[PDB]
């Protein structure tokens, strides 16, 4: 789709864990995924 739709939709993919590593390599997408949630970590996260 478009760009914002992609950010929040892969965000859907990731708030639960669609394990696709392309973004995690993708410097813009990787930085977004790690830190853009407020840093690369969380409290007791959905990525245990």
């Amino acid at each position: 789709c478009n760009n914002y739709m992609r950010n929040e939709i892969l965000d859907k993919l990731a708030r639960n864990g669609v394990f696709l590593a392309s973004e995690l390599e993708d410097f813009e997408c990787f930085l977004l995924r790690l830190s853009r949630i407020g840093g690369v970590i969380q409290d007791t996260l959905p990525v245990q």
Partner: protein, 127 residues
Amino acid sequence: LWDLLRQSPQPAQALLELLLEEDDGTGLCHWPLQNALVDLIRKALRALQGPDSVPPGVVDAIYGALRTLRCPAEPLGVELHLLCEELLEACRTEGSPLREERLLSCLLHKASRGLLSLYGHTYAEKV
């Protein structure tokens, strides 16, 4: 069109990425957009610097405008270190919605680690 700052990090992120173009070089094109969004955050904060109640945006739109600011590394003007010290000496405060802390939380990008170092220098200055 500054309303996508709050609207979504999907939206604020997409606007910051596409409006100024992703130029991977020394080109200074469309720096006014990042500077103006930086200033929008700067207003939202400098105004939050007292006891006034923060309306909607100093909690999402100030953040989006700031995320739209590539006030980058390399030798820059007084604004980069000034806003760096702002976020940092802001992390030396509380009560309204700004700091260097959530700043660092949601402000890890290509044009930001060097500004973070500048924030270190000016934050030693503030402390």
